[PDB]
């Protein structure tokens, strides 16, 4: 069941979607990027390992470009002003079954579902109030 | 209106859904828990801070328990056999607009969407290949 | 093309086969893991290195679990009651051609072929008699 | 009955097979040797012992020669230009039944089956890619 | 689709072409080798890394052998009389777009094109004058 | 057989080609540049020397400008953000004949030919996957 394929990272109803495609598999770490320069592209990486005696850990990283007023193909500096970073670590005990892992995935999806508090706060440049 | 509201963490289609409700805001950490004992409850936390002069950082954590009943000294107690921990750190430059932040939210949602590589690998107890 | 793919480790006809899938390639050691709980999964690893100026060495390891349920204090967990460990080291001189390597592989396959003395002894909990 | 018998180590169809025959059983180590000159012969050894209170350990070794003629000072001798060495160690707990042992053997056979990643890498003078 | 595929390293017009095929990806170094013994094979390697915060570096190496048969201790062995080594280091800023990278590739191709000064000098065992 | 002449570094089908012409021969090092400012020009250099007792080494360097969003004739800073560098070293044993050197040139051409893995990865801002 090979799964290292391109997917839609940002869905805009079919027009203007952001697709990321496989770009690197060095050291077993899967990497996806959008069709941009490295400084302006969406980037996804994912790897999993045995973190401890009784846990496995997925390490998932995402880079998102700032798009308002950007210059496509231009040199934008400083780098830290134009990019957002997501660092996500999922620790799962070795006892978890496929059913348990499906539940964990549902928890993450529900956490980030549109209309829920956490995505609402992020989208509104706000905290919890 | 306040964004500190209850939400469905695990959507099972209306029956057996896991709901978490606001439970604490002490020390600037927003907390949600399911309607269980503290030993067996699901848990969600979220905080935001000015990590540096030009970036803001969200710190989001989720705990998924595997519930069980443990006999301690001849008495049965509600415990969690183990817990799965999700840790998300999201750094956003102060220059990001609301539309830029909406892109970040859509990227995360698309990352975890059903059928996409990363959730499929997690649900299947496997890496990406 | 790529040989870091899913494969059938235990061929139980067509139904009930044990399949292992790539999970990790850290430090140049490829790792395959079967699905469901990691505590009960099969494990295969393989690495190759230049052991001397004239020799290359393959290191291959396989773990076969005995699946069981552990119950301690009323808490049930899926575990391996015990595991069987295979450690293989194969040294091949740099002078060997593709034809020579194919012959070496045939030797290993013939060593473990059904009806032959060594697989028969292993399958019968027996030595050589 | 007896498993200390002649067997086909390399199966080259029906003509040109490499057959090894019992030669020695000293110190509880069974040894098979192919025919013709010993300097060029294939070698297989196998022994089993109680490695710990709960484990039995098989030690299996195979030598594959590259046949050649050595000429020193006009004197010709049949030799092996070099040899490939396989060393296998298999540990099986005393609790394993005959069914469990048959499963372990199937795992080894499936590991080395044609088309699978590890035999393919060996036959192609290659690693995992 | 994966870009880790076999390719014709030396094009002789369809007869006598030298083909290299994927052979290893351990430690993040992609390797190709020809269908020969390791002592006589052609070799290609390629890796990419973030050399600094704003540049990426490709490291590409090729080995071209001059094959021969060497008598060592009265036994003939396949060796390389000597090897020619090509080492390429290519540094690209993160701000380069795909079109910018295509220009880099075209520049290298035009540099080595038949009839151009540098390949002519190399083929003629001479410098540029 | 003088060979220090202008050549087409980037071929765009006859219209828009990038030609580089001789611009310096100090210290015996041949240099070509395009018709631009030094900060925005294509630049090629080549020299050859006796690197060791049994090897000669060609040192070939190429500089390629970033063209997307450039400003022709403008001051573009920092320099490292607008230019890509190729450093290529070809080591050839003194025993190699003209025929051997022609084969080496073919190897380089095949390495960089359109549609092959290495140029494909570079053009797509990607590694090997």
């Amino acid at each position: 069941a090979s799964n290292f394929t391109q997917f839609v990272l940002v869905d805009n109803g079919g027009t203007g979607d952001v697709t990321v495609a496989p770009s690197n598999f060095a050291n077993g770490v899967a990497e996806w990027i959008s069709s941009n320069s490295r400084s302006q592209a969406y980037k996804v990486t994912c790897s999993v390992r045995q973190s401890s005696a009784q846990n496995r850990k997925y390490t998932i990283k995402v880079e998102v470009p700032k798009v308002a007023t950007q210059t496509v193909g231009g040199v934008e500096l400083p780098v830290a002003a134009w990019r957002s970073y997501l660092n996500m670590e999922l620790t799962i005990p070795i006892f978890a079954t496929n059913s348990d892992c499906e539940l964990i995935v549902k928890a993450m999806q529900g956490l980030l579902k549109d209309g829920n508090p956490i995505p609402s706060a992020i989208a509104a440049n706000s905290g919890i109030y």
Side-chain angles (χ1 to χ4, degrees), chain A:
Chain A
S2 179
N3 49 28
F4 195 11
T5 62
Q6 70 173 7
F7 65 99
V8 175
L9 188 59
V10 179
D11 184 81
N12 294 315
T15 67
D17 296 354
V18 172
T19 301
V20 293
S23 59
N24 206 337
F25 200 63
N27 309 97
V29 179
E31 175 193 290
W32 298 261
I33 63 176
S34 64
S35 181
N36 298 88
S37 63
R38 304 291 293 201
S39 58
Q40 292 182 338
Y42 296 75
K43 185 171 70 173
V44 179
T45 63
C46 175
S47 58
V48 61
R49 67 178 178 92
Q50 186 82 16
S51 58
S52 71
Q54 291 189 351
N55 295 122
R56 293 185 316 118
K57 174 177 295 184
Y58 287 85
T59 296
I60 301 164
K61 303 179 186 293
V62 181
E63 296 183 9
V64 177
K66 166 180 170 51
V67 175
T69 73
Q70 65 178 19
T71 299
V72 179
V75 178
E76 293 173 333
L77 300 173
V79 171
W82 287 92
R83 297 189 69 78
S84 304
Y85 304 89
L86 169 64
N87 171 244
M88 161 186 165
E89 300 185 359
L90 177 61
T91 296
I92 306 180
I94 58 174
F95 311 105
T97 63
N98 284 12
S99 298
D100 305 340
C101 293
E102 293 172 15
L103 188 147
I104 298 170
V105 168
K106 288 185 175 303
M108 300 185 295
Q109 294 173 353
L111 174 75
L112 292 181
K113 185 182 182 181
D114 182 81
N116 286 346
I118 309 304
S120 297
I122 296 172
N125 265 312
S126 311
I128 305 294
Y129 59 91

mmCIF file of all heavy atoms in Angstrom, chain A residues 12-33:
data_model
loop_
_atom_site.group_PDB
_atom_site.id
_atom_site.type_symbol
_atom_site.label_atom_id
_atom_site.label_comp_id
_atom_site.label_asym_id
_atom_site.label_seq_id
_atom_site.Cartn_x
_atom_site.Cartn_y
_atom_site.Cartn_z
ATOM 1 N N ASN A 12 -9.280 24.804 -2.549
ATOM 2 C CA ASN A 12 -10.007 26.036 -2.827
ATOM 3 C C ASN A 12 -11.181 25.778 -3.763
ATOM 4 O O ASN A 12 -11.506 26.598 -4.623
ATOM 5 C CB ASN A 12 -9.079 27.097 -3.412
ATOM 6 C CG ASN A 12 -8.026 27.556 -2.427
ATOM 7 O OD1 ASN A 12 -8.323 27.819 -1.263
ATOM 8 N ND2 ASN A 12 -6.787 27.656 -2.890
ATOM 9 N N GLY A 13 -11.834 24.630 -3.605
ATOM 10 C CA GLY A 13 -12.994 24.310 -4.408
ATOM 11 C C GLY A 13 -12.705 23.819 -5.807
ATOM 12 O O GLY A 13 -13.622 23.788 -6.634
ATOM 13 N N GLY A 14 -11.463 23.432 -6.102
ATOM 14 C CA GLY A 14 -11.083 22.917 -7.394
ATOM 15 C C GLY A 14 -10.327 23.899 -8.268
ATOM 16 O O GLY A 14 -9.549 23.474 -9.128
ATOM 17 N N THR A 15 -10.532 25.198 -8.068
ATOM 18 C CA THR A 15 -9.809 26.230 -8.800
ATOM 19 C C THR A 15 -8.914 26.977 -7.822
ATOM 20 O O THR A 15 -9.393 27.495 -6.808
ATOM 21 C CB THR A 15 -10.770 27.196 -9.493
ATOM 22 O OG1 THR A 15 -11.486 27.952 -8.508
ATOM 23 C CG2 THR A 15 -11.761 26.431 -10.356
ATOM 24 N N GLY A 16 -7.621 27.030 -8.126
ATOM 25 C CA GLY A 16 -6.672 27.639 -7.221
ATOM 26 C C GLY A 16 -6.176 26.739 -6.114
ATOM 27 O O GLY A 16 -5.597 27.242 -5.144
ATOM 28 N N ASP A 17 -6.391 25.430 -6.217
ATOM 29 C CA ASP A 17 -5.914 24.507 -5.200
ATOM 30 C C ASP A 17 -4.391 24.494 -5.159
ATOM 31 O O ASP A 17 -3.717 24.733 -6.164
ATOM 32 C CB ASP A 17 -6.427 23.092 -5.469
ATOM 33 C CG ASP A 17 -7.934 22.990 -5.388
ATOM 34 O OD1 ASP A 17 -8.584 23.986 -5.010
ATOM 35 O OD2 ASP A 17 -8.470 21.908 -5.702
ATOM 36 N N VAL A 18 -3.850 24.208 -3.982
ATOM 37 C CA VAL A 18 -2.413 24.061 -3.796
ATOM 38 C C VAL A 18 -2.114 22.575 -3.667
ATOM 39 O O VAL A 18 -2.501 21.935 -2.684
ATOM 40 C CB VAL A 18 -1.913 24.833 -2.569
ATOM 41 C CG1 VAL A 18 -0.455 24.504 -2.307
ATOM 42 C CG2 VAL A 18 -2.098 26.329 -2.764
ATOM 43 N N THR A 19 -1.421 22.029 -4.657
ATOM 44 C CA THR A 19 -1.003 20.637 -4.651
ATOM 45 C C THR A 19 0.478 20.564 -4.309
ATOM 46 O O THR A 19 1.272 21.387 -4.769
ATOM 47 C CB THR A 19 -1.263 19.978 -6.008
ATOM 48 O OG1 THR A 19 -2.658 20.059 -6.320
ATOM 49 C CG2 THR A 19 -0.845 18.519 -5.988
ATOM 50 N N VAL A 20 0.844 19.585 -3.488
ATOM 51 C CA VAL A 20 2.237 19.312 -3.170
ATOM 52 C C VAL A 20 2.569 17.920 -3.684
ATOM 53 O O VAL A 20 1.763 16.993 -3.555
ATOM 54 C CB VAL A 20 2.530 19.436 -1.660
ATOM 55 C CG1 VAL A 20 2.372 20.879 -1.207
ATOM 56 C CG2 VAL A 20 1.627 18.518 -0.855
ATOM 57 N N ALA A 21 3.750 17.780 -4.277
ATOM 58 C CA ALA A 21 4.152 16.536 -4.905
ATOM 59 C C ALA A 21 5.444 16.031 -4.279
ATOM 60 O O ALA A 21 6.221 16.821 -3.736
ATOM 61 C CB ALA A 21 4.351 16.718 -6.416
ATOM 62 N N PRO A 22 5.692 14.721 -4.323
ATOM 63 C CA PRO A 22 6.926 14.184 -3.737
ATOM 64 C C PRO A 22 8.158 14.839 -4.338
ATOM 65 O O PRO A 22 8.249 15.039 -5.550
ATOM 66 C CB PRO A 22 6.860 12.693 -4.083
ATOM 67 C CG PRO A 22 5.416 12.407 -4.210
ATOM 68 C CD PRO A 22 4.796 13.650 -4.790
ATOM 69 N N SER A 23 9.112 15.174 -3.472
ATOM 70 C CA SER A 23 10.328 15.845 -3.909
ATOM 71 C C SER A 23 11.605 15.303 -3.288
ATOM 72 O O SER A 23 12.683 15.630 -3.790
ATOM 73 C CB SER A 23 10.240 17.347 -3.611
ATOM 74 O OG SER A 23 10.059 17.570 -2.225
ATOM 75 N N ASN A 24 11.534 14.506 -2.225
ATOM 76 C CA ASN A 24 12.725 13.957 -1.594
ATOM 77 C C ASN A 24 12.329 12.798 -0.692
ATOM 78 O O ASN A 24 11.289 12.847 -0.033
ATOM 79 C CB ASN A 24 13.477 15.014 -0.779
ATOM 80 C CG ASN A 24 14.951 14.699 -0.646
ATOM 81 O OD1 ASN A 24 15.362 13.549 -0.778
ATOM 82 N ND2 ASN A 24 15.755 15.720 -0.382
ATOM 83 N N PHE A 25 13.161 11.754 -0.682
ATOM 84 C CA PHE A 25 12.984 10.623 0.221
ATOM 85 C C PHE A 25 14.297 10.244 0.896
ATOM 86 O O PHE A 25 14.447 9.109 1.358
ATOM 87 C CB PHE A 25 12.383 9.426 -0.524
ATOM 88 C CG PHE A 25 11.737 8.404 0.377
ATOM 89 C CD1 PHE A 25 10.641 8.739 1.152
ATOM 90 C CD2 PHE A 25 12.202 7.100 0.416
ATOM 91 C CE1 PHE A 25 10.037 7.804 1.974
ATOM 92 C CE2 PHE A 25 11.600 6.159 1.231
ATOM 93 C CZ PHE A 25 10.515 6.513 2.010
ATOM 94 N N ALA A 26 15.252 11.170 0.955
ATOM 95 C CA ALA A 26 16.523 10.901 1.610
ATOM 96 C C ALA A 26 16.312 10.607 3.089
ATOM 97 O O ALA A 26 15.473 11.225 3.748
ATOM 98 C CB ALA A 26 17.469 12.090 1.440
ATOM 99 N N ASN A 27 17.080 9.645 3.601
ATOM 100 C CA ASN A 27 17.047 9.216 4.997
ATOM 101 C C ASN A 27 15.685 8.664 5.408
ATOM 102 O O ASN A 27 15.377 8.594 6.600
ATOM 103 C CB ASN A 27 17.458 10.349 5.943
ATOM 104 C CG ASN A 27 18.764 10.998 5.540
ATOM 105 O OD1 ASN A 27 18.775 12.037 4.882
ATOM 106 N ND2 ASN A 27 19.873 10.381 5.920
ATOM 107 N N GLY A 28 14.857 8.274 4.445
ATOM 108 C CA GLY A 28 13.540 7.757 4.742
ATOM 109 C C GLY A 28 12.511 8.806 5.099
ATOM 110 O O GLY A 28 11.376 8.448 5.431
ATOM 111 N N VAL A 29 12.868 10.085 5.041
ATOM 112 C CA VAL A 29 11.960 11.173 5.381
ATOM 113 C C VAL A 29 11.250 11.620 4.112
ATOM 114 O O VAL A 29 11.890 12.089 3.166
ATOM 115 C CB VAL A 29 12.714 12.343 6.029
ATOM 116 C CG1 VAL A 29 11.754 13.477 6.350
ATOM 117 C CG2 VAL A 29 13.446 11.882 7.275
ATOM 118 N N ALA A 30 9.930 11.472 4.086
ATOM 119 C CA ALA A 30 9.149 11.874 2.927
ATOM 120 C C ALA A 30 8.974 13.387 2.908
ATOM 121 O O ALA A 30 8.666 13.995 3.934
ATOM 122 C CB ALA A 30 7.789 11.183 2.937
ATOM 123 N N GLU A 31 9.179 13.993 1.741
ATOM 124 C CA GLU A 31 9.047 15.435 1.579
ATOM 125 C C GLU A 31 8.166 15.730 0.376
ATOM 126 O O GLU A 31 8.322 15.109 -0.679
ATOM 127 C CB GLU A 31 10.415 16.110 1.413
ATOM 128 C CG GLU A 31 10.336 17.603 1.113
ATOM 129 C CD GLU A 31 11.661 18.184 0.641
ATOM 130 O OE1 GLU A 31 12.596 18.289 1.460
ATOM 131 O OE2 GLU A 31 11.772 18.516 -0.557
ATOM 132 N N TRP A 32 7.232 16.661 0.549
ATOM 133 C CA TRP A 32 6.412 17.198 -0.523
ATOM 134 C C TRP A 32 6.666 18.698 -0.625
ATOM 135 O O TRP A 32 6.905 19.364 0.385
ATOM 136 C CB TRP A 32 4.915 16.969 -0.265
ATOM 137 C CG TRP A 32 4.438 15.541 -0.170
ATOM 138 C CD1 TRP A 32 3.833 14.814 -1.153
ATOM 139 C CD2 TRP A 32 4.483 14.692 0.984
ATOM 140 N NE1 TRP A 32 3.508 13.564 -0.686
ATOM 141 C CE2 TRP A 32 3.900 13.463 0.622
ATOM 142 C CE3 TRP A 32 4.964 14.851 2.287
ATOM 143 C CZ2 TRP A 32 3.787 12.399 1.514
ATOM 144 C CZ3 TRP A 32 4.853 13.793 3.170
ATOM 145 C CH2 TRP A 32 4.271 12.582 2.778
ATOM 146 N N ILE A 33 6.607 19.236 -1.845
ATOM 147 C CA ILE A 33 6.686 20.678 -2.064
ATOM 148 C C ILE A 33 5.711 21.085 -3.159
ATOM 149 O O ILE A 33 5.353 20.288 -4.030
ATOM 150 C CB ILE A 33 8.110 21.161 -2.434
ATOM 151 C CG1 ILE A 33 8.563 20.543 -3.759
ATOM 152 C CG2 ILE A 33 9.096 20.902 -1.306
ATOM 153 C CD1 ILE A 33 9.906 21.044 -4.232
#
